[PDB]
C-alpha cells in the first residue's frame, strides 16, 4: 500500500510561534491528502482536505501545502486550543492509509510543582492494603522525578507514576506517584517521604509524614 510517514512523533512549540507538521507519501498522491486533529478524549476532527482546503470552523491560522509526495500542515501563530495529535490521510482510492500522528505540545514558561503527600486511608488499611500518594501539581516542563524514602531508605519497587494530559487552559502538567505496600509492611515503618526533582530548582521539594503522627 501507500505508506504515509510523519516527520516527527512529537512537537513542542511556544504560543504565537509558527508550527509545521510534516507528512510524506511513498508514492505520488497528487492533492489527495487530508489532516485530522485528535483530542485527548478521542474526538477526531477534519481540519484540512485536498492538501490545502480548510474545513468547518477551522481558524485562518491553518494552511496546507503539498508537492504530491511531501506535505505539511502549518499553524501561523500557535494558540492554546491547538493541543492535540495530528494525522495525515491519503484518499486517492482504496486502501486508504494514514500517518502515525504527531503529538503537539505547548511550550510554556517553566513552573515549579506544588507537592502534596497522602497517607493511606483508614478504609484501605482496614482491608489489609496501604497506598501512599505523592501529588505534584501544575508544573512545566513535563519531565519530573519523584524519589520515595521509607524510614530514610530509597524505595523503587511498588511505585507507579502517571501524568495528566497537558492542561488545555494554562499548559501545565500534574502527576501522581503511588507507593503500594501491605498494611503490615506499612506499619513496620514510621517515616514516609517523597522528593520531587524538577529543572525549576536544583534542590528537590520534599514532603514527609510520620506514621506515629508527627
Amino acid at each position: 500500500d501507500i505508506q504515509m510517514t510523519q516527520t516527527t512523533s512529537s512537537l513542542s512549540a511556544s504560543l504565537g510561534d509558527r508550527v509545521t507538521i510534516g507528512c510524506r507519501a511513498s508514492q505520488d498522491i497528487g492533492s489527495y491528502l487530508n489532516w485530522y486533529q485528535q483530542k485527548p478524549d478521542g474526538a477526531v476532527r477534519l481540519l484540512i482536505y485536498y492538501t490545502s482546503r480548510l474545513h468547518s470552523g477551522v481558524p485562518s491560522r491553518f494552511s496546507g501545502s503539498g508537492s504530491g509526495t511531501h506535505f505539511s500542515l502549518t499553524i501561523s501563530n500557535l494558540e492554546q486550543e491547538d493541543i492535540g495529535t495530528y494525522f495525515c490521510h491519503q484518499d486517492t482510492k482504496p486502501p486508504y492509509t494514514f500517518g502515525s500522528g504527531t503529538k503537539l505540545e505547548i511550550k510554556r514558561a517553566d513552573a515549579a510543582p506544588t507537592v502534596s503527600i497522602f497517607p493511606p486511608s483508614s478504609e484501605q488499611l482496614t482491608s489489609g492494603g496501604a497506598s501512599v500518594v505523592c501529588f505534584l501539581n501544575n508544573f512545566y516542563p513535563k519531565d519530573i522525578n519523584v524519589k520515595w524514602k521509607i524510614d530514610g531508605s530509597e524505595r523503587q519497587n511498588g511505585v507507579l507514576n502517571s501524568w495528566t494530559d497537558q492542561d488545555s487552559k494554562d499548559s501545565t502538567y500534574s502527576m501522581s506517584s503511588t507507593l503500594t505496600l501491605t498494611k503490615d509492611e506499612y506499619e513496620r515503618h514510621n517515616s514516609y517521604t517523597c522528593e520531587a526533582t524538577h529543572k525549576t530548582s536544583t534542590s528537590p521539594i520534599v514532603k514527609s509524614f510520620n506514621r506515629n503522627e508527627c
Binding site: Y49, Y96, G101, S116, S122
Partner: protein, 220 residues
Amino acid sequence: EVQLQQSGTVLARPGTSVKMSCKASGYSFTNYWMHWVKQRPGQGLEWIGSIYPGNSDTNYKQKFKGKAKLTAVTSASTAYMEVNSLTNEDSAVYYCTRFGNYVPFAYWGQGTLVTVSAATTTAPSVYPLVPGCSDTSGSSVTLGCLVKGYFPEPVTVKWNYGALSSGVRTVSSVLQSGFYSLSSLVTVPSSTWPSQTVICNVAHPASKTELIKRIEPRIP
C-alpha cells in the same frame, strides 16, 4: 446535525467475535459511504473498509477480508462491523466515519473500545485521598480518590456529580500485573472542604458500576 453514535465498550475472549454499531442521524443514511478505522495504541490509524447503505456495496483493505464484516440496516439507520477470531492485535478503538461529498471524513463517531482478554471484569476499589492530620497551610486543600485494581478500561472520574470541574486533575490509567489504576485530585478553597460534600464519582462501564466516595477528614 450529523451525528455518528457508536456502541459502548466491549470485553471479548480470544477466538470469539464482537459486533459493534454506529447509528447515523441528521442526514440521508443511504446516500453516503460509511467507513471504519482502527486505532491501536502507538500504531497510528488503519483503514478497515467501507459500505454504501443504499445498495450494500462494500470494500475492504485486503487484510480485513474474512476478518471484519461490514453491514448496514436502513430501517435502523445503523452501520455494523463484526470482527471475528479475536486476538490481542484486535484490541483497539474503532471509529465509524462518513465520507463525502467533496470532502473526505467530515464526520466521526466517538469510537468503540474493544478489549480482547481472557480475564474477567473487575470493578475498581476506590479509596479517599485525605491530607495528613493537619500539617499544611492553608487556603487551598487538595483532595482525591485512588482508583485501584480494575479491568478492563475505561474508568471516568467526576466531582460532585460533575458540578466541580475547576482544579480537577485526573492522571492517565496505568497497567500493572493485569489490572488498571488511576487517581483523580481536586484542589478547592479551604472554606468548601470539609464544609461541603466533596464526593468523587467513579464509573466503570464494563462492570456497570457507579461508585461514590465521600471525602472526609481523618479520625482525631
